[PDB]
């Protein structure tokens, strides 16, 4: 489900911001990556009856290539011990998220 997937991402983002230990932020990012990759294969209401090959659906899955890439970025920083950097990196997903709500809701 798409709306669940975003609940995951929004919740776990908060977990990173509020985190006390590096294990928290890495486990959060890992959860966010799956939800993101999960959402990419969904189709939202505004494109209910659009072809999977259409521009709109190409755009949908393309945007998630950014969101996953930005997550992957934060995950790599965390896995490399740049854990403060991984946290700042994750703040960027708010911009990505705003572009989603703006376009599909």
């Amino acid at each position, epitope marked *: 489900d798409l709306e669940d997937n975003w609940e995951t991402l929004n919740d776990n983002l908060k977990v990173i911001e509020k985190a006390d230990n590096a294990a928290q932020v890495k486990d959060a990012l890992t959860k966010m990556r799956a939800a993101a990759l999960d959402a990419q294969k969904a189709t939202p209401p505004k494109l209910e009856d659009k072809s999977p090959d259409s521009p709109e659906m*190409k*755009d*949908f*899955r*393309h*945007g998630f290539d*950014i969101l996953v*890439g*930005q997550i*992957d*970025d*934060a*995950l*790599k*920083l965390a896995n*490399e011990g*740049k854990v403060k*950097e991984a946290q*700042a*990196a994750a703040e*960027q997903l708010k*911009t*990505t998220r*705003n*572009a*989603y709500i*703006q*376009k*599909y809701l």
Partner: antibody
Amino acid sequence: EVQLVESGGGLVQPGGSLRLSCAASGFNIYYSSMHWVRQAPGKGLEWVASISPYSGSTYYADSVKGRFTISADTSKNTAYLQMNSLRAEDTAVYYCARPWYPWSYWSGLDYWGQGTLVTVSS
Amino acid sequence: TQSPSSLSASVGDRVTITCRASQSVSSAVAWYQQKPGKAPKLLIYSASSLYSGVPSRFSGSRSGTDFTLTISSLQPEDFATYYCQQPWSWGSALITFGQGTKVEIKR
């Protein structure tokens, strides 16, 4: 002080190949996002590709997708733009740029190379 | 593909350049300055933040689906071309630059 010094531009014929260099000094190119931005004679800035070396995440404009290939060599501390199947419309001054933090590209590109001219012509 | 727009103004003039976004422009936009032969310089980052060493007569604001670069009093060395970095939209290319605006001396 962050410095980006480019090289590799020059002449090439349609369909040829050419590899641009963006040599970085003042920071470790591993932890950054490097971007190529080009500008055809008399026209505007067009973003082309970017790479986050440490993570390998890579992005491309549609106009060069499948033909260009951005990369980085951290030991040499430089990023590259491999340009294959070139055409006349690829004639431009090519810049490399980098944001403040590896993840702040959407806020602006702070540092720029000086640019190198690429002329595609037979 | 596109050539810069042009605009004539005198020293001391107030000029405001507008870039148009396909949605609520929100924060992650930038403004660059470029003079001939030279790379662009970052002027305004994050919609309204003044980059270092940029005079305070430059300012950047944002309203609805538009965002703006304002030069409160054009100085001779502000005649240049100005570029905006469009806000990302879902599915778009990672970075997109606006058309470009060349400010020239009225006489």
